[PDB]
Amino acid sequence: GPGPSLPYIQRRIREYEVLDEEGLQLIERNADVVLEEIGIEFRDDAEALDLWKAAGADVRGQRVHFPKGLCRELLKTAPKDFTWHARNPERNAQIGGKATVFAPVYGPPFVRDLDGNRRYATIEDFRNFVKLAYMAPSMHSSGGTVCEPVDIAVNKRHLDMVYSHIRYSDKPFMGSVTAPERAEDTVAMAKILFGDDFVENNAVTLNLINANSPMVFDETMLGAAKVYARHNQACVVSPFILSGAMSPVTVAGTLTQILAEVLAGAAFTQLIRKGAPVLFGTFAASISMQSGAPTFGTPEPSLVSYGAAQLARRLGLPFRTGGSLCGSKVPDAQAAHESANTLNMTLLAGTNFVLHAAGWLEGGLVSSYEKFMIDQDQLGMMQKMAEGVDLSEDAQALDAIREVGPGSHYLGCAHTYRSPLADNNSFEQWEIEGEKRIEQRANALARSWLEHYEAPYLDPAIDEALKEFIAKRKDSMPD
Template identity: 65%
Template sequence: MTDESAAPVSSGRRGRSGGGADARRAARTATTITQAGFIRRAIKPYEPFTDEQLQLIEDNAEIVLQETGIDFYEDEEAVQMWKDAGATVTQGNEPRRFRLRFPKGLVRSLIKTAPREYVQHARNPANNVTIGGNNTVFAPVYGPPFIRNLDEGRRYATIEDFRNFAKLVYMLPSLHHAGGTLCEPVDVPVPKRHLDMIYSHIKYNDKPFMSSVTSGERAADSVAMCELLFGKDFVDQNCVMTSLINANSPMVWDGVMLGALKVLARANQACVISPFIVAGAMSPVSTVGTLTQLLAEASVGIAFTQLCRPGAPVVFGTFAASMSMQSGAPTFGTPEPAFVTFGAAQLARRMGVPFRSGGGLCGSKIPDAQAAYESANTLWPTLLSGVNFCLHAAGWLEGGLASGYEKLIMDADQLTMFQKFAEGVDFSENGQAMDAIREVGPGSHYLGSAHTQANFQTAFWRSSLADNNSFEQWQDEGSKDIVVRANAKWKQMLRDYEAPALDPGIDQSLQDFIAQRKAVLPDSMS
C-alpha cells in the first residue's frame, strides 16, 4: 500500500486550521473503527508476596541506594540536580561518570508527588486511556529491526512496514494504544527516522502513541509535533505521550535516556521507567535479588522525573526475562520472570504509581507453538498481576528482534480473550440464569431455552481466527492453519484500511516542521 493515497488522521481540534470543507468531507467518508476501549479489570490482582516479604525487598533496595549506589553517565546536569537534592556524588572510573548514593528515604520522599494514575489523551478523545488503578492498556510490539511475514520470511524493516503496522494497530480494537517504534525503518537515516515514525502515528492512527527517546533532541521533536497537533498549552497541562525510558542495567543511568527523560518530564509527558533486566546477566539469578535491584534502579528514575517536574506522570516499569544458563540467550514464558512481574506489580502499588510489564513475549523465530505457549505464559501473569501499561502485547517474535505481521494478528485475537476474562463473572439476574434452570428442568437441554436464545451471541468468547469446524470441513476449505488465516486477514485489513480524518492545516504544519528539521539533520545512517 502507498501511504500517500490514504486520507489523513485527527481530531482537528487544535493547531493551524485550514480546508474546513475538505476536513468535514474526510470526516464524513472515513471508516468508523469500533474500539473495545481499555480494560477496566473487575478481577483482583494475584499477589503472591506478603507485606513482610515486600518490606524486606524495599529495605534491601534502600541499602543498595545508600551503600552501592547508582552510576549516572554523561549527564552532569542530572548529577548536579541530585546533588542539590541531597545525594552524595563521587567521581567514577571514567570521565563524566559519577557514582550517586542516596540517604535513606530521599528517593521515596520525592516519589510522593507522582500521580497514582493519569489520562493519556489521544487525538480522538474517544480513544483516551487511563493508565493506573484497575486499568490495563495493551500496546503493540516495540523496537525490532526486522519484520517477518509468511510471504517474505525475515528481512529488515522499512518505513512502509512501519506505516502498515500503524494502520493495522488502528484497526485492531484489542490494542488500546498505538505504541512507539513498531519496527525500526532502516531505510530512513537514524537522525531523521523519528520524524517519519511520529508522523505515521499521527496520520494513520488516532490512538495515543509514544515519543522518540533515542536522544533528548528527538524527544523534543516529538513534543513539538504534539504541540502542533494538540496545541502548546494543552500539551503543557495534559499527557499526550507515554514513552519508554530504560535504565542501563545493572545500576547505570546513561546520558541518552536521561536526556530524553528530562525533556519529556519537563513537558509533563509520561515516562515509563523500565530497567531492562535479563536475570542472570543484568541482575542476580534469584527472584528476590532481581526485585531488589529492579526497585533500586526504577525508584531513582521515577524520583528523577519528579525532580524535573513535580507531579509529572510516571510509570514503574520492568522488562522481565530470564537467561538460558547454557546458551546465554533470553528465555520467555518461564516461572521466574512471572514472579518478578507479580512482585514488581505489588511494589508499584505500594509506591503509589502505575505499573508496566509483560506482553506477548517469546523467543521463537516464527509464529509457531513455541511462540504461542511462551506468549500465553507471559500474558497471563501480565493480566493477573494487575499490569497497567502492557508494551509488546502483540507482534513480538525472536526475543524482540522481529515484528511479525501474522503474530500481530494472532496475538490481538488472544487479547480479546484477556479482555473478556478481565470483566470477571456476571452475577446479575441474567447471569444467575434461574429462569433458564426453571424452564428446562431435569433431563432436557438448554439449546432452545429463552435464556440461551437471548444470550447465544455473547455468552462465550469466540476467536476470530481459530478453526473449530469438523476435520472434513477444514480440509475442504484448504487445510489452512492459523498462520495462513492470519496472513490473509492482515492483507485484507490493509486493503480495507481508511485513515481517520486529519485537519489539512494540522497535516501541513506537521509536514512543514518535518521538512525544516530534515533540512538541518544529517543523512548519516548512525
C-alpha cells in the same frame, strides 16, 4: 474488517499476589540498602548529578548514593494515575489504578512479512503496523517504535515515525527517545497537533526510559527523560533485565535490583518537574544456563513481574511489564506458550501499561504480522476476562435452568468473546479447507484488514503544519 475499537480495560477482577507483607517489606528494605551502600550510576550527565546533590544525595564520581527513603519521598508528587490523551478524545486511556492499556511491539529491526520473508523493517511496514494497531479492537495505544524503519536516515526517521502515529491512527502514541533533540521534535509535533498549552498540561505521550541494568542510567536515556518531564509527558522507567546476566539469577535479587533502579530513575523525573507523570516499568526475562540466550515464558520472569506489580502499587506508580513475549523464530506452539504465559501474568498482575502486547517474535528482533494478528486476538480475550463474573439476575439464569430442566439442552432458549482466527470446526471441514494452521488464517486476516483500512480523519491544516515542520527539520540536517 474488525469491529469498533474498545476503550481501555477497567479491571473488575483481583490482582494476583506472590509476596506476603513480610516478603514485600524485605525487598523494600533491601532496595534501600542497595541505594545507600552501592548507589546508581548517572553517567555523562552533569546536570543530573547536580540535581541529586541538591536533593541531598551523596555523589561520588558518577555514582549517586541515596539516603534511606529519599527516592520514595520525592515520588510523593508523582501521580498514581493520569490520562494519556489521544487526538481523538474517545480514545483517551487511563494509566494507573484498575486500568490496563495494551500497546504494540516496540523495537524490532526486522519484520517477518506477509510473504514469509525475514528482512529489515521499512517505513511501509511501520505504517502497516500502525494501521493494524488502529484496527485491532483491543489495541488501546498506537505504540512507539513498532519497528525500526531502515529506509529513512537514522537522524530523520523519528519524524516519520511520529507522523505515522498521527496520520494512520487516532489512538494514543509514544514519543522518540533515541536522542534528546528527537524528544524535543516529538514535543513540537505534539504541540502542532494538540496545542501548546494542552501539551504542557496533559500527557499525550508515554516514553520509554530504559535503565542500562544493572544500576546505570546513561546520557541518552536521561536526556530524553529530562525533555519529557519538563513538558508534562510520561516516562516509563524500565530496567532491562535478563536474570542471571543483568540482574541476579534469583527472583528476590532481581526484584531488589529492579526496585532500586526504578526508585532512582522515577524520582529523577520529579527533580526535573514535580508532578511529571512516571511509570514503574520492568522488562524481565531469563537466560538459558546452557546457551546464555534470552528466554521467555518461564516461571522466574512471571514471579518477578507479579512481585514487581505489588511493589509498584505500594510505591504508588502505574506499572508496566509483560506482554506477548517469546523467543521462538516462528509463530508456533513455542511462541504461543511463551506469549500466553507472559500475557496471562500481565493481566492477572494488574499491569497498567503493556508494551509488546502484540507482534513480538524472536526475542525482540522481529515484528511479525502473523504473530501480531494471533496476539491481538488474545488481547480481546483478556479484555473480556477482565470484566469478571456477571452476577445479575439474568446471569444467574434460574428461569433458563427451570425451563430447560434435566435431560434437555439450552441451545434453543432465549437466554442462550469470538475469535476470528480459531478454527473450531470438525477435522473433516478443516481438512477440506486446506489443513490450515492459525498463522495462515492470520496472514489472510491481516491482508484483509489492510485492504479495508480507512485512515482516521486528520484536519488538513494540522497535516500541513506537521509536514511543514518535518520538511524544515529534514532540510536542516544532512542524512
